[PDB]
Amino acid sequence: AQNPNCNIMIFHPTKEEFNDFDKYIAYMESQGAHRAGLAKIIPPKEWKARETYDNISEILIATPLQQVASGRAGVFTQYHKKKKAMTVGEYRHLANSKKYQTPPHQNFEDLERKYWKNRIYNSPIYGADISGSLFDENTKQWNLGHLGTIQDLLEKECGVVIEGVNTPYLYFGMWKTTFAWHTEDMDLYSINYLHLGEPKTWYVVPPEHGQRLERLARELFPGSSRGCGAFLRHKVALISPTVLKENGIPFNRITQEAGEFMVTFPYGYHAGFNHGFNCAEAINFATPRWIDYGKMASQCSCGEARVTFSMDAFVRILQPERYDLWKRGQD
Ligand SMILES: O=C(O)CNC(=O)C(=O)O
Ligand SMILES: [Mg+2]
Ligand code: NI
Ligand SMILES: [Zn+2]
């Protein structure tokens, strides 16, 4: 069995290997990359996402979100307070202001220490889930707006034609912006490209050990667990690496820098934080190996998780028994 310790693997495809996206995902899996839940892909030196980032300041962040924490430094939840719209240029200036800018630090490890010590005492502002793309239309390799769609994959694998679409989303981050512990909708893959700016640190639990993280989370967040048998789908709970180590939960960590891709694999729980002003693009995708995970994915039916239109068909076809309850939670 490849990669039996479930380490995060880093790949360096050549320009020729970068042509066929599906093939390269299946190659990474042949080497055991999915066992970690997360892999890093460094593009060949000849590749670029677009020519420059000099003209993105007029993109609108319609609903910036202030991430307010509650709890203790290593075990907290966050809620998102809506703020007035602002452009990317306005947000960049805000991120770089004295109130929000990255503090002085020695290296990534020191900054990670500072994040876990101090995150809860501040409320950073995040642009999230902004439909759009920064890939040039002429970029033919690993262009996150030109991937094979999940609806087409389900049709190819299972024969059923379904409604829905699959487009990418932009994220604008700042120091301490935080992504809570979660798997993807319907335990899909994700891919994330860091277009510009400061890094993103990731934490990940191997898919084979995801239920260990869920059990800890039910212990640490006991009211939330009583409210919903899949409350991590709310995407609000944080647990630090120190707490995970104290409780014997298997995980790994890695820092993504600008110009790098990260792939998350089905049922790989992940969380993390941004180091400073940055812009990322991400999208969900499927492969044939996903189908079995989609069929078994938990679902939130309490009303909290609310998700895209296109998840309807996935639940309806892959999880017909759960469909009526889940749709009630959508309405
Ligand atoms: O840019 C981001 O914070 C969100 N990314 C993830 O959880 C992911 O791509 O799966
Ligand atoms: Mg612009
Ligand atoms: Ni994710
Ligand atoms: Zn719920």
Swiss-Prot record:
GO term, biological process aspect, one: regulation of protein phosphorylation
Q: Which residues carry this modification: PolyADP-ribosyl glutamic acid?
A: E16, E17
* Annotated residues for binding of Zn(2+): C228, H234, C300, C302
- Can you supply one Gene Ontology CC term for this chain's record? pericentric heterochromatin
Q: Where in the cell is it found?
A: Nucleus
Transmembrane ranges, per UniProt, are: none
Q: Which residues bind Fe cation?
A: H182, E184, H270
Bound how, and how many: what does the cofactor note say?
A: Binds 1 Fe(2+) ion per subunit.
Q: Which reaction does it catalyse?
A: N(6),N(6),N(6)-trimethyl-L-lysyl(9)-[histone H3] + 2 2-oxoglutarate + 2 O2 = N(6)-methyl-L-lysyl(9)-[histone H3] + 2 formaldehyde + 2 succinate + 2 CO2
Instruction: Report the protein name in the record.
Output: Lysine-specific demethylase 4D
Q: Which organism is it from?
A: Homo sapiens (Human)
Q: What is the lineage of its organism?
A: Eukaryota, Metazoa, Chordata, Craniata, Vertebrata
